[PDB]
Amino acid sequence: HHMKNFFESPFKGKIIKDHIQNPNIIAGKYSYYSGYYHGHSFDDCARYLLPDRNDVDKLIIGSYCSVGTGASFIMAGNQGHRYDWISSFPFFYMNEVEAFENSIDAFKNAGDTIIGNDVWIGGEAMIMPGIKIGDGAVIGSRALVTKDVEPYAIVGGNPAKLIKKRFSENQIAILLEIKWWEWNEEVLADAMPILCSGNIDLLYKFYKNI
């Protein structure tokens, strides 16, 4: 029952879609997890995600995302606790107690957890159940994300709050139209020096000439 480190070094991550074993995690190309400081593979970032059921909330991750060490995505909805029932205790799941035999299942799904494309998640951020995070967002280290995150928003804190957006509203609108994460690798390679800059207007010109 020993705990092992899946990462040889702080300075090497692992591409998520190449290493996950949980079929209820879906991950896009190139997105990676850098998990040296917490040891476990990315599968264990998806807490309480049942691997053997097709009717539970899934964890969906876009392309070109960066996930920091010990980030977690809380799955399984309410985990069998209803705070609007008289007790939050999950009687239905403790079936070794005769007194609990007529208990009722409190479990509720929350909806899928959806991480967009080009999302940078800092170390030990924690995403609550059912949350949607827009394309281009930045989730600060240790952010406790209780609400959906707008595209290109930088959020931080516990609870997480908007700090600022990465670009202006008009610039964001341009990026959401052109969706560079959908480009094939030949087109992406040609755009690479522009993508490694802030020149959204130039990328727009590039896109129009594809």
Automatic annotation (TrEMBL):
It comes from the Bacteria. GO terms for molecular function: chloramphenicol O-acetyltransferase activity. Signal peptide: none annotated. Its EC number is 2.3.1.28. One of its GO terms (biological process) is response to antibiotic. It is an enzyme of class 2 (transferase). Keywords: Acyltransferase, Antibiotic resistance, Repeat, Transferase. It catalyses: chloramphenicol + acetyl-CoA = chloramphenicol 3-acetate + CoA. Belongs to the transferase hexapeptide repeat family. NCBIfam families: chloram_CatB (NF000490). This is Chloramphenicol acetyltransferase. The gene is cat.
